[PDB]
Homo-oligomer: A and B are copies of this chain.
Amino acid sequence: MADRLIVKGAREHNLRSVDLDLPRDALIVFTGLSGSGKSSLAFDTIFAEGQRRYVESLSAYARQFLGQMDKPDVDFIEGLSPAVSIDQKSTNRNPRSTVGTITEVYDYLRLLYARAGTPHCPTCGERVARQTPQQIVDQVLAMPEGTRFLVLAPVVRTRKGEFADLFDKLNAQGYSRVRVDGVVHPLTDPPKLKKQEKHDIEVVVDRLTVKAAAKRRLTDSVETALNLADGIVVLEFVDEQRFSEKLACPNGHALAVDDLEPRSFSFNSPYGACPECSGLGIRVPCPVCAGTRLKPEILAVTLAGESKGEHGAKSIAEVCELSIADCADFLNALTLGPREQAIAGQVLKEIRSRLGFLLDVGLEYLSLSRAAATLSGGEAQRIRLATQIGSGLVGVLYVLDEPSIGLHQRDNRRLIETLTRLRDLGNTLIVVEHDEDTIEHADWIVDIGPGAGEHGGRIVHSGPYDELLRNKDSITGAYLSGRESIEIPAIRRSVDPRRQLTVVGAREHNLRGIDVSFPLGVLTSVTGVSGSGKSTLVNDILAAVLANRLNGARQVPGRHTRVTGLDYLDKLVRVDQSPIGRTPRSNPATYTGVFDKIRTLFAATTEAKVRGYQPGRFSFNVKGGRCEACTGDGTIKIEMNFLPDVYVPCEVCQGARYNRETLEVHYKGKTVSEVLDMSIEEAAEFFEPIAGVHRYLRTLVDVGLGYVRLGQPAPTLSGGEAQRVKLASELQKRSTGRTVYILDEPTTGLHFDDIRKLLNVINGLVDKGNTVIVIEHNLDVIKTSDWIIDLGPEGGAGGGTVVAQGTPEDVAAVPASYTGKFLAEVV
């Protein structure tokens, strides 16, 4: 029938026509190593194929995307369904759109602020309402019964001019009544008029007081005035009342919002955009934002009536500041009106379903106004997880990245249950996740890339994960199932009371002003369920202050009082998964610092001696070293008439960003193109006489960059490998023990073996007399560190405090943190 999915012919990088058939509508995992090929095998190729198939079948634009995107690197793919990529691929990074808009609830914010918010004009606080003639005619009831008035049709309001001809025309129609400059005369015998003299021409139409059931004559003259007077009349207390119709404000005033319309409060749209920031929120905030990312008129004046929950009186910015939980609980129960209930029931249902899935993932501490940059990858990953589990399309295919980033252990287990829900839905699941518990908890597991780099990409194991245990060759299989594992260091480097960096007064956001101490020169790790605070505790305060002081920057100090520890460190250098550089001038080889070295060595070639090639001339940055047509990229770009772009290798450059003149020099029997393209593995093997570069390259190989090549582009390598090369380079940069620095979650996409390799690397960094604090939720980071601090019992409400600051074994003994609980479980 339809119960299995087959892929055949995965031939790319280390993948060698790798193939596999699996049971559709089950839970399946993809394991292996870093760079083992699973990344592209699952995301780049299989997801590309499925999405391309569905978009071509349906009418997505031209049914296409990237012109078939990648060519099919599978001899045959069968039994498929439209793939769904649950990945950290991308999000909404627009500064105009904050997480409030990204959460598909800015529309609902505007919906509520339209009518629930104060529907009143800013100028006079009068309920914004539009012009109507029916109210004009019905206003006769408002004016007391029997009170004299006049049927005054303002035909020509205040427009002065000698208009005896107009008098004659009005007679030609036939009314016999008129009033000019507020004085009545008969059209039969009107007064004289001059252009200089002001003439307020409101023609009397009929003789009437407030009578009973006089609507016949009333309407007769009244719609007449609504045309002649053009919509306006007055019933004065001639014995006051004005029978006028005005749009927007009833009094003809301007409005912050022209009416009760949600888009009026959309600064991403020009409705709410400031004159001086255009929705960006900057000029230093623009003078008309002052913290609120909205126009001051459209901040609260026309929308202060949001009676959400209790005491509800909110500005658009106020709801923005309402955290996830704050706004969700506010909207859980609120009384704004029956029509509002009818037209916002869908609003409540969408929001509550979204929040239920958000809790199913365990994500509330983020705020509606919280900067989208706070997305930790795992955050947006969980956003999409909730979206797709709520979608409920049964049988759809779903390929998962690793969402554990920014998550706790048993929280991740509960999320694993969340996905097993989708498995039970009949949906097909292919997984990728370093969490062990995720492993051993799937209907099927396929381990790949027996070797990590280009050398290994085959499916070393393919079974119920039992064949992973039976598959000893799978190094990751051995690491996970227990054939081998990382080890706890015998010695936890003792505290250093003298040189200790201690933050005091840290109350930024969730933080409760607690003070946190950290020894310097000995390894340390920080723990806490995501949302606890450590992230901004360091970034916004510790790292921010230390960096802008030691290096004289202007970073945000954060909410803190003081930070001791500066005197013990020569400087701070924040280092994280970031790349080396987006520009073409930034490439592995060039930006690793070996650029000038290779340039000089190539100048030292025998040919370069008989050629006089300057080292800077061996740079593509200068024109001499590069092909000017390529501008330093060694390729030809080809765009044509409304057709996709193509690229070709440049011939003079030979694809090396170095014209043939530069490439002719063949340092050590190798041109610049060669000494770029060869792998980092053979680079460490090579340059043996060159002490510095050889040490750098072998350090890179130890970090595990052998299969990568020095000549690769910067974009071609992941941020994890970028930090790998950065740590390898800084390894030989005279640490002196005082370069105590900071680090983020490094466990991203690392197999246990390379995890332990980097563990040894950081052990060396610590033995250098230094400490690079690490923000890692993982267990082994703590189990190997020698000082540990947990941000309160749990995240958010738990966070902003400390439960065990001291030794890793101290926190292990401490059960106040689940981190210490799992430590007690294992060491």
Chain A residues with a Cβ under 8 A of chain B: 1-2, 24-25, 51, 53-61, 65, 75, 78-85, 90, 107, 132-134, 219, 263, 269-270, 278, 346, 387-388, 391-396, 425-426, 628, 640, 642-643, 646, 651-652, 661
Closest Cβ of chain B to A221, distance in Å, is 14
CA distance A393 to B55 in the complex (A): 12
Does A396 lie within 8 Å of B82, measured CB to CB?
Answer: yes
CA distance A430 to B2 in the complex (A): 18
CB contacts (< 8 Å) of A269 on chain B: these are: 643, 646
Which residue from B59, B81, B270, B393 sits with its C-beta under 8 Å from A53? B393
How many copies the complex holds: the figure is 2
Does A82 lie within 8 Å of B393, measured CB to CB?
Answer: yes
Does B392 lie within 8 Å of A80, measured CB to CB?
Answer: yes
**From A58, A65, A642, residue with most partner B Cβ within 10 Å:** A58
Does A395 lie within 8 Å of B393, measured CB to CB?
Answer: no
CB contacts (< 8 Å) of A393 on chain B: these are: 53-54, 57, 80-82
Chain A to chain B: the 3 pairs with minimum beta-carbon distance, closest first: A2-B426, A2-B394, A2-B395
Does B81 lie within 8 Å of A394, measured CB to CB?
Answer: yes
Which residue from B75, B82, B395 sits with its C-beta under 8 Å from A54? B82
CB contacts (< 8 Å) of A57 on chain B: these are: 84, 387-388, 391, 393, 396
Which residue from B107, B387, B394, B661 sits with its C-beta under 8 Å from A80? B394
- Main secondary structure, interface of A, reads loop
CB contacts (< 8 Å) of A643 on chain B: these are: 269
Does A395 lie within 8 Å of B85, measured CB to CB?
Answer: no
Which residue from B60, B78, B80 sits with its C-beta under 8 Å from A51? B60
Which residue from B75, B81, B107, B132 sits with its C-beta under 8 Å from A396? B81
CB contacts (< 8 Å) of A134 on chain B: these are: 651-652
Which residue from B2, B107, B394, B661 sits with its C-beta under 8 Å from A79? B394
A selection of 15 A-B contacts at a CB cut-off of 8 Å is: A1-B25, A51-B58, A51-B60, A53-B391, A54-B54, A56-B387, A58-B84, A59-B85, A80-B395, A81-B82, A81-B396, A82-B82, A134-B651, A134-B652, A270-B640
Given A59-B85, A269-B643; 18 other pairs, CB 8 A cutoff: A1-B25, A51-B59, A53-B391, A57-B387, A57-B388, A58-B82, A58-B84, A58-B85, A59-B90, A60-B61, A75-B346, A78-B394, A80-B393, A81-B393, A82-B82, A82-B396, A107-B642, A219-B661
CB contacts (< 8 Å) of A346 on chain B: these are: 75
CB contacts (< 8 Å) of A81 on chain B: these are: 82, 393-396
Closest Cβ of chain B to A334, distance in Å, is 22
CA distance A643 to B108 in the complex (A): 13
Does B628 lie within 8 Å of A132, measured CB to CB?
Answer: yes
CA distance A82 to B646 in the complex (A): 33
Closest Cβ of chain B to A343, distance in Å, is 8
CB contacts (< 8 Å) of A132 on chain B: these are: 628
CB contacts (< 8 Å) of A78 on chain B: these are: 392, 394
CA distance A51 to B59 in the complex (A): 8
Closest Cβ of chain B to A413, distance in Å, is 25
Closest Cβ of chain B to A278, distance in Å, is 8
* Closest chain B residue to A102, Cβ basis: B63
CA distance A1 to B26 in the complex (A): 11
CA distance A51 to B60 in the complex (A): 9
CB contacts (< 8 Å) of A55 on chain B: these are: 60
Closest Cβ of chain B to A539, distance in Å, is 28
CB contacts (< 8 Å) of A270 on chain B: these are: 640
Does A59 lie within 8 Å of B84, measured CB to CB?
Answer: yes
Does A56 lie within 8 Å of B391, measured CB to CB?
Answer: yes
**From A51, A53, A107, A395, residue with most partner B Cβ within 10 Å:** A395
